[PDB]
Amino acid sequence: SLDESSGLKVREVFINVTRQQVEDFHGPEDYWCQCVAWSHLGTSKSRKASVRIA
Amino acid sequence: LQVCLPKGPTCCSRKMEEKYQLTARLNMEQLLQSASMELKFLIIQNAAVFQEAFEIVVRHAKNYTNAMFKNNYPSLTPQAFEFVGEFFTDVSLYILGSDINVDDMVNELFDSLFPVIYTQMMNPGLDINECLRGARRDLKVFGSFPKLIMTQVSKSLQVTRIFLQALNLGIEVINTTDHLKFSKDCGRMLTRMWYCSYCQGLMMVKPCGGYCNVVMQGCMAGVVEIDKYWREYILSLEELVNDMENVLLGLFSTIHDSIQYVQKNGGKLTTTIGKLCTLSSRRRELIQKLKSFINFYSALPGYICSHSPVAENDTLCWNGQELVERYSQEPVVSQIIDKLKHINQLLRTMS
Amino acid sequence: LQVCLPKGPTCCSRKMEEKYQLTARLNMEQLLQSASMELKFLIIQNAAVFQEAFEIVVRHAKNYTNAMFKNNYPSLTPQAFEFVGEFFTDVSLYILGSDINVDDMVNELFDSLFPVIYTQMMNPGLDINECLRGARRDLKVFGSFPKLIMTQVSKSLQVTRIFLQALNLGIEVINTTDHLKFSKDCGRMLTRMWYCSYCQGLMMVKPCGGYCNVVMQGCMAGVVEIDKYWREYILSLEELVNDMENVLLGLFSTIHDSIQYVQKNGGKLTTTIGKLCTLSSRRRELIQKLKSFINFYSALPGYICSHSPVAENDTLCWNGQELVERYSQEPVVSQIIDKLKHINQLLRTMS
Amino acid sequence: YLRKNFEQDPQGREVPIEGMIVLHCRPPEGVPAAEVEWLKNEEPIDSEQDENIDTRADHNLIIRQARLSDSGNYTCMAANIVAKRRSLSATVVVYVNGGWSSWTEWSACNVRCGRGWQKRSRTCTNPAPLNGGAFCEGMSVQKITCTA
Ligand SMILES: *[C@@H]1O[C@H](CO)[C@@H](O)[C@H](O)[C@H]1NC(C)=O
Ligand SMILES: *[C@@H]1O[C@H](CO)[C@@H](O)[C@H](O)[C@H]1NC(C)=O
Ligand SMILES: *[C@@H]1O[C@H](CO)[C@@H](O)[C@H](O)[C@H]1NC(C)=O
Ligand SMILES: *[C@@H]1O[C@H](CO)[C@@H](O)[C@H](O)[C@H]1NC(C)=O
Ligand SMILES: *[C@H]1O[C@H](CO)[C@@H](O)[C@H](O)[C@@H]1O
């Protein structure tokens, strides 16, 4: 994508998470996911979103 | 001094006596832990293995049910996966001791199954959902299938749940043994038997075998009484092993036949509703290994004396107060016995 | 000072002000009691009379049943006296508000009556007693007589029980009226209206009629709100009076006919069992006298001002702070309203 | 004269292994004063037989510890020269709450080179649920990735 406020390269990534992935996951913490973005200067991590079976 | 009987002079003060008492406490606890470690690890291993094996069985049965829904009733997916997953989740939760109602599992399963059958198989083409859920039980659309599954699975799930509870309670009492705190009089007697010889300036003298016997039979009078109940626990577990894999794995055939049964009366049903709205090997090896520890509580003082430094000859030994040529001669236990009685009654009623 | 507004000097201290406040409290309580006394005595008289009359009716009905048993079925005495006394004791206990089941009264009556009938009237000649008690209900030996008596007596006893409870709660609220504690601000306003003129040295000056009206409408804003519920109470009681003497007095005839009915099938019954084993005037006058007090709560401030010394002309009168030529111009109440709402719902439902 | 309806029936209670519970009983109105007797599962209980159970002058059954007197259907019964009356039986069930475990040591990485595994167990045995106690809440196993 390209933003209107500023002409710079924007990236939007979507990842599907199924129920079978969470119910079959036997880790120590709640099924969490993090987002890492790569730049010419370095990298940046996002919030750890924990997908749980309600 | 309040422990070391001063017959001559003495090389130790009151504070050294307290240090010897605490070291006696630690030595007794370590000896009990060493006595109980083999059996504790055996029961922990088996509890873990059986838990994982039952979870594997439940997962495989859920997979089999989902696969036969995919193959025979594609029109019921993906809703079929939701209620199958909820059903087997509640199954596992019941197996692991949670408060789950088996009859409620089966009833919610059929309550969720009927509306999708009606909307996708019988009358193709959200708010009317509850009317269908009520009509499921009011018109007995599934016949005797729900009660058949109810009894079939309740009978196996209760014995499996109580098997796991029995394993866990055995772990509990065996863990309590090595944390059994004793009387003050026994603390002083153990201090005399193990250390008070050092206060009289002796370096390598060991207590007499008979003195160790009288001391141990002195403070283990309560603990030895557990032996009857522990033996009954072992034998009742043996009674129980002499069942849940076959049932959960035939569940798919039973449900398929129930769906056929409901489809059989579709003519009247649609009009009425439109108007109205290696495991057995493991438990055998476990029982055969558990019967080797049936003497655990009766052989316990013998273990403490045979693994403590003692003069078995009863010659040139320490008698608690002097070096002789020849020797002259509970609330937590109540809780252990209470829980053993409870689990034994529960076992015996099951088989 | 905290009550008497000092415009000039003053002839009274703070302690005299407290004395005047307490005398104001006593005067208000006396005026309310004088307003409520006629109605209180009316309801107390009627409550006492109805209570004694119902007890007389129950005693006389028990007497008549016992006498008809003595005369017609001497073979059933003295056991008949025991179960008749227990039945009418439970009757009175239900009338007076105790938790008694009417159906259970009748069922225990016939359960006790049948075995003595069988042993003394049908099969002449203690352990087999319970088999007879079971056979009474299992074979329906008394036909529809038990249910007939059950409804006949439950219908009258419930209306009588609720009539007595309604009379007692009316007594309760009327006793609460003259004991209604008021706000501190109203205490000070009444002290100013009745006595603070004496602190300014006046001997016979009376408060203005309009000042009495504003003060009374000031502290009776809550009490006047009771009028709606009191009117509904009166009218619901009138709805209820438009019953228990006839039923309890015909009970003996009904029981005799039931005994005849059971004796009618003795042939088959003995073999099968041997093998197997001025009031209405008073309530009318009460309601006609009670309707004269339907304005009780709305006319109450008018009563307090018309029976307190006031200058009706509003000329040369006391306005709470000075002598003028012309005048310028919950919790316990909540409990009263709660109980009135409760008793009104209970009244209306028996209608 | 003895009444049928009990003045106050004993109430069923849920009590932990160490908890104390008092079972209240008010016999029906009667002359003479009703003689209250406690029956555990339709069988009388002896106050002198055990320190844990005792009978009070005001007809109350006090249990200090749920160990010396476990679950049952306690029933209050009033006896009189007239007759006897049974109260509604109270279902007293003693429950044990689930109690996990102290963590174990981390296991060695099964794989010598690359992604390995380390396990830590936390059992539900201190105390183990009894007579339908609530099971332990949360996970029983802990697994972490290791690089050797
Ligand atoms: C019932 O009435 C008769 C009338 O002669 C009387 O003699 C008897 O004492 C009365 N019994 C009771 C219990 O009132
Ligand atoms: C109201 O009940 C109370 C209770 O002590 C009593 O003091 C009072 O005399 C009764 N009321 C009337 C106004 O007679
Ligand atoms: C206790 O009472 C219940 C029903 O009141 C019953 O299911 C149970 O089997 C009874 N028996 C006992 C505790 O002996
Ligand atoms: C053994 O008892 C100790 C006391 O700290 C406890 O920490 C440990 O969890 C126990 N083992 C069990 C509960 O099986
Ligand atoms: C065991 O684990 C923790 C203790 O930190 C608690 O969440 C709870 O007591 C549980 O049963």
Numbering used by the authors:
A (entry chain E): 100 to 153
B (entry chain A), C (entry chain C): 61 to 185, 191 to 307, 314 to 348, 382 to 433, 455 to 476
D (entry chain G): 154 to 301
Q: How do the authors describe this structure?
A:
Unc5 receptors consist of two extracellular immunoglobulin domains (Ig1–2), two extracellular thrombospondin-like domains (TSP1–2), a single transmembrane helix, and a C-terminal intracellular supramodule, which contains a ZO-1/Unc5 (ZU5), an Unc5/PIDD/Ankyrin (UPA), and a death domain (DD).
To produce complex crystals, we mixed hGPC3core, mGPC3core or murine GPC3 residues 31–488 (mGPC3488) with Rattus norvegicus Unc5D residues 32–307 (rUnc5DIgIgTSP). The complexes crystallized in two different space groups with different crystal packing. Two GPC3 molecules wrap around each end of the Unc5 tetramer. Each GPC3 chain interacts with three Unc5 chains, forming interfaces with the Ig1/Ig2 domains of two Unc5 molecules, and with a TSP1 domain of a third Unc5 molecule. Interface 1 is located at the C lobe of GPC3 and interfaces with the Ig1 and Ig2 domains of Unc5D, burying a surface of ∼690 Å2 (mGPC3 complex) or ∼640 Å2 (hGPC3 complex). Within the octameric arrangement, the antiparallel Unc5D chains also form interactions between themselves, especially at the Ig2 domains: the buried surface amounts to ∼900 Å2 and ∼840 Å2 for the major antiparallel packing interactions within the Unc5 bundle.
